[PDB]
Design a protein around this ligand. Structure first.
Ligand code: HEM
Length: 280
């Protein structure tokens, strides 16, 4: 059993955008790191129908790259609006104890909002990965717009998981006007603009209760004019794709880095890559 393990997560509200072919940078493998676990979460439209027949390229390109490095895909789960994939180095897996399980929760009759939780155990420690999606206009269990449901929160279980990650666009925005928000961005006053971010509000309302986000030093990841680093000020600049972490059992989870990937400009949101070291 190792004392520690490393986890990379990436999420991207990628909308209708085709998957990129440079996956190495997206997964944080391009400086030669070899994480134990990799989770990838996407939000968008039309994944399950998969009109563009992107599913086949994804599988082929990801499996190429990751199978070479020792990874096994634990699960891919696709809905109309969300994608969650979890990989782990094959050398950590015991078939007999893995208890690899996923649930899908949907909140609306069109199955467009809700979330996905994938969990598995290695070395007698349980990991859970959540992604979620909510629209501004939906009527919800929380009577808020935030992409939280207690059914997706494995920290509220009777037997809570040891390491928990929640990755995606939480539908948390920056609650101030665009002028003021842009001024703070231009001043690099990231903490000043985070003062207006709605995660703290969601937490006051007991949503994402006890979940921690790594310190944010990067500029808002939305809304960009595609292929540029210029904000489109039709929306207040906001942190859309987030990574939250928790333990249910007093385990240490240490963020190593947390950053938006500015090289992926093809769309209005920039992906966010987080790296953690967990102590078993
Ligand atoms: C229109 C856009 C997209 C569509 C329709 C789509 C559709 C799909 C489908 C159908 C699968 C499952 C394929 C199968 O199991 O046979 C899949 C897997 C996947 N997609 Fe997407 N996707 C899209 C965008 C993206 C984007 C932007 C990413 C970003 C990296 C991404 C990452 C993944 C990953 C990692 C898998 C699992 C690959 C594997 O290891 O087998 N997808 N997608």
């Amino acid at each position: 059993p190792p004392a520690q393990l490393s986890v990379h997560t990436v999420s991207w509200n990628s909308g209708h955008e085709r998957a990129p072919t440079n996956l190495e940078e997206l997964l944080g493998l391009n400086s030669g790191e070899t994480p134990d676990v990799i989770a990838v979460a996407v939000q968008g439209f039309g994944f399950q129908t998969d009109k563009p027949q992107q599913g086949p390229a994804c599988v082929k390109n990801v499996q190429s790259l990751l199978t070479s490095k020792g990874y096994t895909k634990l699960k891919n789960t696709i809905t109309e609006t969300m994608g969650l994939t979890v990989y782990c180095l094959e050398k950590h897996l015991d078939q007999n104890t893995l208890k690899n399980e996923t649930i899908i929760v949907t909140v609306d009759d069109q199955k467009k909002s809700g979330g996905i939780v994938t969990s598995f155990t290695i070395y007698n420690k349980r990991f859970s990965f959540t992604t979620s999606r909510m629209s501004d206009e939906d009527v919800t269990s929380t009577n808020t717009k935030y992409a939280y449901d207690t059914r997706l929160d494995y920290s509220k279980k009777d037997d809570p998981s040891d390491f928990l990650f929640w990755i995606g666009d939480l539908n948390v925005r920056v609650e101030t006007n665009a002028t003021h928000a842009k001024s703070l961005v231009d001043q690099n006053n990231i903490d000043g603009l985070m003062a207006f971010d709605q995660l703290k509000k969601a937490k006051e309302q007991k949503l994402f209760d006890g979940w921690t986000e790594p310190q944010v030093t990067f500029k808002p990841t939305y809304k960009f004019k595609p292929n540029t680093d210029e904000y489109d000020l039709s929306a207040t600049p906001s942190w859309t794709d987030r990574a939250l972490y928790k333990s249910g059992t007093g385990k240490t989870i240490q963020p190593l880095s947390y950053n938006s990937l500015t090289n992926y400009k093809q769309t209005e949101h920039r992906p966010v890559l987080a790296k953690f070291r967990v102590t078993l």
